[PDB]
């Protein structure tokens with residue numbers, strides 16, 4: 001997967017496992033959510049293309065959101081969209097599969113950097129807009145969480161298990177966006 | 191309500207109604223959510239003390255969260271807790287009741303400032319910790335959203351209406367935290 005450097009950034013994030021413990025406590029993420037986000041694994045594995053169709057559909061239907069993938073001339077950069085799509089697809093699996101350990105935190109830092117002007121457009125060597133305004137990362141917690149529910153509900157598991165998977169996904173999405181604020185936030189205010 | 195200055199800050203926020211329109215689109219908030227957040231009004235009105243008992247209970251049971259209300263000596267500042275509680279109670283009603291217009295945006299800016307070192311501890315003239323790290327504001331979207339659901343479900347309205355009220359509350363909480371990032375975020379990155 002071009003540009004995907006999980007576990008090999010060779011850069012230790014400015015947050016550690018103690019920070020993560022406290023952040024998990026604030027978002028109410030426990031061992032129960034680890035169990036159920038992992039069960040979401042097998043459920044979502046075969047559906048990732050349809051999930052990305054939904055998410056890219058949402059972005060593409062809103063000029064002010066599609067903006068973030070545009071070339072200077074205002075048209076969508078198709079190379080950029082396609083390359084990011086492969087990494088975004090993989091993130092769905094990583095969220096369900098990966099242990100949230102230091103390697104995971106180091107990639108969280110990287111993902112935040114890539115939305116921020118610090119590293120945006122470098123991974124794919126594209127010319128596009130310099131920064132994704134942080135307000136929209138937070139806003140996206142809702143669509144990224146809520147649009148996942150129909151996909152969780154399809155694989156013939158109990159509605160009770162689906163609800164637990166869904167709450168785990170909401171917490172995990174929130175947790176990650178909180179971490180991605182680091183490069184946006186004034187030093188010492190994070 | 192001491193310190194509550196909604197509609198009388200006399201300061202125009204750095205975001206306007208066009209910004210709000212675009213942010214509402216990103217969080218999927220529509221006229222349907224306005225209808226249902228308003229219906230949450232009558233439902234939550236009589237329950238606000240119990241809601242705050244729940245939220246203050248959550249904060250109080252976690253030393254690293256209760257930290258934000260502590261005096262320098264590490265003990266909770268009871269005056270601070272009580273004064274904030276009255277404004278936090280009112281915010282529940284404002285979220286359901288108020289039109290999200292420019293006055294509302296101007297108070298959103300104010301609330302963000304009060305969590306941030308810019309204005310924290312000034313409203314109540316207390317000595318406490320200088321800043322609430324932004325990571326925790328995002329994290330709190332989960333507990334503030336999820337713990338509201340049992341209160342929405344109690345007033346004998348249909349489960350279908352409860353679900354619509356709940357989704358509206360999730361979107362509104364997310365929307366607000368997105369706005370409150372403004373004083374935390376490096377200038378031009380919001």
Ligand code: HEM
Pocket residue numbers: 003004005059065066068069084087088091111114115119120121122123124132136137138140141144173177
């Ligand atoms: C909950 C919020 C969001 C999630 C979960 C999310 C997820 C992701 C992921 C997983 C990647 C690929 C990371 C990698 O390189 O491995 C990515 C990249 C990207 N996302 Fe987001 N994203 C969010 C918010 C946004 C928003 C609001 C936009 C605006 C359209 C956006 C546009 C982009 C763009 C343009 C890239 C490529 C950045 C680069 O140049 O490297 N994302 N996102």
Ligand code: HEM
Pocket residue numbers: 193194195249255256258259274277278281301304305309310311312313314322326327328330331334363367
């Ligand atoms: C979804 C996230 C949050 C919501 C909805 C929320 C809501 C509120 C509201 C409505 C107020 C009163 C605003 C006013 O002055 O009118 C307030 C103040 C305050 N909140 Fe939050 N809050 C959030 C996150 C946090 C977190 C994570 C903490 C950490 C314990 C916290 C601690 C405080 C403190 C210490 C104040 C007083 C700030 C000051 O000195 O003026 N809040 N909050």
